[PDB]
Design a protein around this ligand. Sequence first.
Ligand SMILES: CCCCCCCCCCCCCCCCC[C@@H](O)O[C@H](CO[C@H](O)CCCCCCCCCCCCCCC)COP(=O)(O)OCC[N+](C)(C)C
Ligand SMILES: CCCCCCCC/C=C/CCCCCCCC(=O)OC[C@H](COP(=O)(O)OCCN)OC(=O)CCCCCCC/C=C/CCCCCCCC
Ligand SMILES: CCCCCCCCCCCC(=O)SCCNC(=O)CCNC(=O)[C@H](O)C(C)(C)COP(=O)(O)O
Lengths: 111, 104, 220, 458, 67, 88, 124, 62, 128, 175, 178
Amino acid sequence: MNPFASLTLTTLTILTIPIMMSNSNIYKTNLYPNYVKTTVSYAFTLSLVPLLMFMHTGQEMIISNWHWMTLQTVELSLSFKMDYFSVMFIPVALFVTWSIMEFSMWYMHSD
Amino acid sequence: QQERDPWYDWDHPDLRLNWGEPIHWDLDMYIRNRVDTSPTPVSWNTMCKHLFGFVAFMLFMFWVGEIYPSYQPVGPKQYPYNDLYLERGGDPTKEPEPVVHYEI
Amino acid sequence: TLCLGAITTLFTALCAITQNDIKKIVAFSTSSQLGLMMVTIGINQPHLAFLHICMHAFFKAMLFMCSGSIIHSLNDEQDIRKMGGLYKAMPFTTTALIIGSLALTGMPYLTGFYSKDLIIEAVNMSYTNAWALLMTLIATSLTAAYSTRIIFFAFLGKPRFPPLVLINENNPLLINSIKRLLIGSIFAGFIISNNIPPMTVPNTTMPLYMKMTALIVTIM
Amino acid sequence: MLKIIIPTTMLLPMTWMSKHNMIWINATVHSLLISLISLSLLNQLGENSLNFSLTFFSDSLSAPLLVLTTWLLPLMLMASQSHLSKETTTRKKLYITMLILLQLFLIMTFTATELILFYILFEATLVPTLIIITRWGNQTERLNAGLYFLFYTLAGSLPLLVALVYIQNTTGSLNFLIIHYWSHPLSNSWSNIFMWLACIMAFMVKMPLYGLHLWLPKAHVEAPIAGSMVLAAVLLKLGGYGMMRITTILNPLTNYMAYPFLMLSMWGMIMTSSICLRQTDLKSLIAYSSVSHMALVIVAIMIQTPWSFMGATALMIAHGLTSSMLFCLANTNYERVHSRTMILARGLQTLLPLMATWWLVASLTNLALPPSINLIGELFIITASFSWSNITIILMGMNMMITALYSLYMLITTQRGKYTHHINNIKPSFTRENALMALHILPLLLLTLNPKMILGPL
Amino acid sequence: VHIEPRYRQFPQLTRSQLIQAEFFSATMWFWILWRFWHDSDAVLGHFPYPDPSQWTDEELGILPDDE
Amino acid sequence: SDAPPLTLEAIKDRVLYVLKLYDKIDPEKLSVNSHFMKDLGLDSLDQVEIIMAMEDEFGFEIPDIDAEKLMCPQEIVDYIADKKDVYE
Amino acid sequence: GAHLARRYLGDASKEPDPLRMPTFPPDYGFPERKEREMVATQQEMNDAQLMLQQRDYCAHYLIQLLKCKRDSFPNFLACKHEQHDWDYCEHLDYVKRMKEFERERRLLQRKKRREQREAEMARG
Amino acid sequence: RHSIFAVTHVLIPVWIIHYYLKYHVTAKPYTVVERKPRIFPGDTILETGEVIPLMKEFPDQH
Amino acid sequence: SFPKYKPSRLATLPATLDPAEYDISPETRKAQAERLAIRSRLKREYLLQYNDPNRLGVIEDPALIRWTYARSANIYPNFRPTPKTSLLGALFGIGPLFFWYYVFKTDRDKKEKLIQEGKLDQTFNISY
Amino acid sequence: PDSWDKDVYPEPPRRTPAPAPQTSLPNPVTYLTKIFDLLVDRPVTLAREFIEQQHAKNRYYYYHREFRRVPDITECEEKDILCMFEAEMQWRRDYKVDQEIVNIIQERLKACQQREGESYRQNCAKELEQFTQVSKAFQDRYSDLGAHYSARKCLAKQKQRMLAERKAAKEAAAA
Amino acid sequence: AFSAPAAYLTHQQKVLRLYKRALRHLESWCVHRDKYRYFACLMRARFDEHKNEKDMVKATQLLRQAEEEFWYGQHPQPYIFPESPGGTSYERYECYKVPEWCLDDWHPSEKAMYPDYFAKREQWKRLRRESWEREVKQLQEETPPGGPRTEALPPARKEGDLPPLWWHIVTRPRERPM
Ligand SMILES: CCCCCCCCCCCCCCCCC[C@@H](O)O[C@H](CO[C@H](O)CCCCCCCCCCCCCCC)COP(=O)(O)OCC[N+](C)(C)C
Ligand SMILES: CCCCCCCC/C=C/CCCCCCCC(=O)OC[C@H](COP(=O)(O)OCCN)OC(=O)CCCCCCC/C=C/CCCCCCCC
Ligand SMILES: CCCCCCCCCCCC(=O)SCCNC(=O)CCNC(=O)[C@H](O)C(C)(C)COP(=O)(O)O
């Protein structure tokens, strides 16, 4: 089913997993920063694929997945725009965040 | 409170206050997270003149550059189908006045 | 928007050239580049502004990371007046900072070239406010000026830090992160420019002197 | 809806027949059960209200208010049992009796079908509140506070009563359904103007309107913690509920009778937000915050649009929860250090981290961080005001800037900086206090997950 | 990797860091030279900018100052 | 990691090292208990310069009220050790 | 630019106004003028979804370049002939606009001078 | 133990998202809208099989 | 010799630029001694309780209590209606209200007049 | 799919071009999409098939509720409370249905704008016109009733508009 | 920070403080070491030129003129040591400082770890409890009848005494606590 939408949603979704794990027995150990950095690197690698799809065929989408609430004539829904700007900015931000997190593993070692 | 000596052993080091001494009426205004009255290297009434002069000069220069703009020595861009009449909002049932461009 | 961006980039580049804290210099550089982005938006070139955002991320993050490496080496010192000759004492950090400064100044065929050079050419060839154009050119000269300030005071000359030397950049995390951002700062401009559809009409014909304006003002 | 009223009346003798060391447990358990039962009122229709009988009915406006009241009772019980440990058994039972009677009066007030019954219950809420304030308050000012609380209310409500009976002599009914269906316009005469003022001023002083708000800082500062909770969370919303009920008979006079109140609300919202910036007492800051939010609610009710009514409902619910949580947070520090001065105890994040997290979340909801229901109500009201006049975005905008400032100011004063050196009696947070904070904050985000339950009948 | 303080002397340097720095400077310069050798038009401009004065009136269609 | 755990011996060594590089003090005649004014014959300005040299050596500032009182290398070493929580 | 200095400092009467241009009929000085033809159909440009600003008289070369880029996707260095052709077409378009500007300037200056000279002759 | 991160952090979330999008989100109209693909002269349509003609005999300014 | 620095309210005069500390009298020295004596007495009184091993709780500060009381409860008993007080109260409590009333009434009258004439461009204006 | 009516929510015939490879290099997109198919789309399809098999063994139905038409507010006497109540309920139901009609039209407009891409200004003219008409009708019916709206106020608004239109028509007739 | 201040500063103290401030700001202006050494020697010569002025009025006038010149020519952005009151790391580690009395509130399970540390803590608390009254008595004896006139405290003088008011000075958290 045209993996573009699934991959774009999964890239954002997997970033929240360490947030949900922040109350487990990994946030209390010294392996948490590496876990977060690895999650971000995996997110970047996954997000590289929708970028390739766009660079091939110019594919763009909008995904209105959850209907939050509707006023009388105004409908408010959780919708994501997956145009050129989003699919280009996400890998760049993820790459920079990966590099900066690996840097912080050394810079903030005494914190 | 920023003007108080930071090398003294204050009872409250962050507030730079001593226990029992009279508190200024406006202490919460002067807590040094806030309004600072410390002496500056450059006089007040001289910082104000320079800042206002810079701001006013830039505003006036932007106005002047707006009424003396910059451009290239070219004519207007030419678009084929009557300035793309149908593309910029359609209205296909009015037959607009034709826009014609000639070779040169 | 154009006038706001022009005044912002000029004022911040003018403040940056006398600062002594390295983080302050890099922050004012970031503010000046944001002003340039606002200028690009003001001349009706949004896709160029987005491309500049993507280009600037790489070398700006790398420059901040190099500054942090210097700060951590010199016992959390941030004043450039107490940083001496780190060109030989910190070779990899020196290389990364030099490459980042060259990319920030729009040196040809690096990452910053493919956005900043086109932005300057588009500003030159448009029906625009003349004062905004002048401030954009002065700001793009001041960019090279404050880059020179950082390099000259931090890496050249004789040491000015305390005598107990703890300079050490031999740590795989720092090296790998900076190396990744450095590869980006070298090749991302070419890779991204050659892989996007053209959403703008190119300025094919221009006088030679106006084609070299960015390079000339950077050199001056 | 006697299935909710009768269990509270049963809470009364259950408390008075309980063993001396089981009053809190029994009261809390059965209060929570009553809240669970009252949760069923949220099943509302799209066309009319739930008309239980000739005497009681439930709308989409009153059901969240009832749920909030029934949920607030157990929280008040949890917050009160710490500072009442030294009290005698009979006086503790009397305090719990006051709380139960207040809940019963509020429950019957929010569901009365007739306006005179509503008036009687809405005045009956005065007695338990006054008794609680003047008997269990800590300082000597409480007495004065009580007087300010009483007469300010009554001077507004005595004219309303007269107007009410006058209306019943003219139309023959005070039933709200009959009043709505048989509505007739109000002409422009002096008699109609004074009828409008008599119908409006009691609710105005209840909100309270800026200029008529002086009773609120006194009463909400001098009261015990449960008194402050119920005063900020529920009793202020009586004015808004009554105004939204009563405005159905005031058109088209409101079209121009709202101008002085709109000006007062907007400017005084700016003024009370500014007052919050220079406050030495932590409780007074929260009280003035309540005044600003209620000014927003007054503007929403006065402009009389569906979007403004939805925003007003959401804002009332959100403010009730947030202000009650803030009062409890301030009470923890007061019980530790026995002083309400904000700058006395500083750097509390170093000593109490989880309480600092609770402080951060409460202050984030106070400044209406999206997508909290605080922000939803505020944004709906601001959009409606923008439709009313494009210039309002100035004043509203200024308010949004000031609120956050003072909110963060409060946080930065209490949690950050360095701890006070001579204060050495700051014990770790009890399970009771953490549970109180969680039971305040979790419903807020849960309601964010499903906002149509607090958006009202519009 | 253990590098100890020096106290008023040049710090200890490992061969790997100098190798990496030299390699990356060299690769940046090689990329610059290669991209200029292949894409000089990106800098010097591709198309000749004409001089308008050298356009005759025959192709520009202006009459000889009589009509 | 970070800087090594400064010890009293290291502090004293660095203080004496700085003092023997001062051209107004004879190296052999200098000891850890020598008074700047009495034993070494220096005035107040020289003491200010010595305090500033110590500040440059150790990378932190000594306030004037505390710096006025230091008169021998031992007092300087003790002040630095007390400031930096050095006990060994 | 020198045109800006000529207009803002010199005689602005003989300088073309970019916003109000041209002021002379397209067939004033020419005996006959060919109509500037278009290669790409409206439907083709709509299907290619070019842009409202890229739909100029060089749109066919842009369409060819886009098709070649889509066909030669992984080899992002294969569309050099098509890009060069599109650039050449845009360059010719800009040259034509420059010719229009110079024609307007010459026509304005000649017309003003001829009218002034005729009036001067009529003044004696 | 080695590659269990790619299963619990990539594969399972992508399974859940793909199921949710394929069988629930796209069960309602206008929830996933894609802009139409670009069509160029000389292309052939997959569904209809129709081909698009060429482009008006280029003047060939070689 | 050099350009002079002049102080302001928000940028005050430095101590080293103060003439009062360059021309001193034995009376000034006595006053400074008395000030230091008062400070030392307060410091001793505080430190005696601060280091007390049997002291648990908060060391009450009379100065803080005086400050909060003066800022809150001592204000009304010391208020007199004067021309300054009355004028400032009237201005800052009435002027803004009528200013905003005039602004909003004018804006809404203009909008209503435009709506009556049927020229406001209310197309797509569904929600209010 | 068949979940929604395709006339209420129409779509164009969805023309998409066939792949035309011009390079000897392989396509990473095709390889990655084959991997995605085999590794994601098949297990999800099997899980859905199992779930649908379970659902088919328990098939039960729900129904759309039908409301007959009652007299409108125009046919109600002045103080007749019961007829007014029924008419007001019918009017509120009609108001909700009209809101949903506007919502459907807006959904069409938004979908067309996203679908048409760079040609939306010309290719969404019909949806824009439909929204303009529906919005004008809805604004005439329901705007400015305010909070505390009812059927009686709507009737008064319609009567006022009718009177104004009749006066304008008669004045234009005299021209 | 450690020494008790006096009622006023003397002329020599003011001159020395101005000398230190001037040298620091000159170093801020003269970034390089050799240039700073040259101009610092020039500044020292300028300072000791008027060292032997017997007229105190002229000395204070010279000090006044020097302070005016310093305020005119000060560096607007002088170098500050990172942990000094204007530095970039001034109060960085204050959030990590925890007072010792908090250890009294640890749960016994937390205190089950670290038995020896808490035994030593009990010993220190016993010492403080035994010393307090003697400290108070010594302060009562040594204080003049009109209250103390400075903030200086006396040392211990007896056989096994402790210097009065020592607990909160000795049990400072640390400079780098965590
Ligand atoms: C501290 C905050 C307390 C709460 C705030 C409550 C706000 C109450 C303010 C009342 C709002 C308006 C009341 C009446 C509406 C109009 C008032 C009048 O000024 O308007 C003109 C009235 O004209 C003149 O002004 C006559 C009134 C003058 C006498 C009123 C005394 C007002 C002086 C201020 C006293 C302060 C009152 C509040 C005490 C606290 C309009 O001209 P006109 O069309 O003919 O009158 C309309 C009524 N008709 C149609 C029946 C004739
Ligand atoms: C739109 C309506 C309002 C617009 C804004 C008008 C001005 C608002 C005035 C705000 C007053 C708030 C008072 C209480 C604030 C809390 C106190 C406080 O902030 O402390 C001051 C604190 C300390 O100063 P530092 O330099 O950081 O020194 C610290 C190191 N020693 O600094 C601050 O935070 C001051 C910030 C106030 C900013 C006010 C000026 C901004 C005016 C903006 C106008 C320009 C508009 C831009 C238009 C863009 C083009 C479309
Ligand atoms: C950044 C640029 C700004 C800086 C500009 C500064 C300009 C100021 C330069 C000139 C200032 C002077 O010389 S001011 C000259 C002041 N002269 C006197 O006071 C004479 C009496 N002598 C004493 O007081 C002591 O000998 C004493 C000198 C203190 C030595 O102290 P010790 O022997 O007990 O250690």
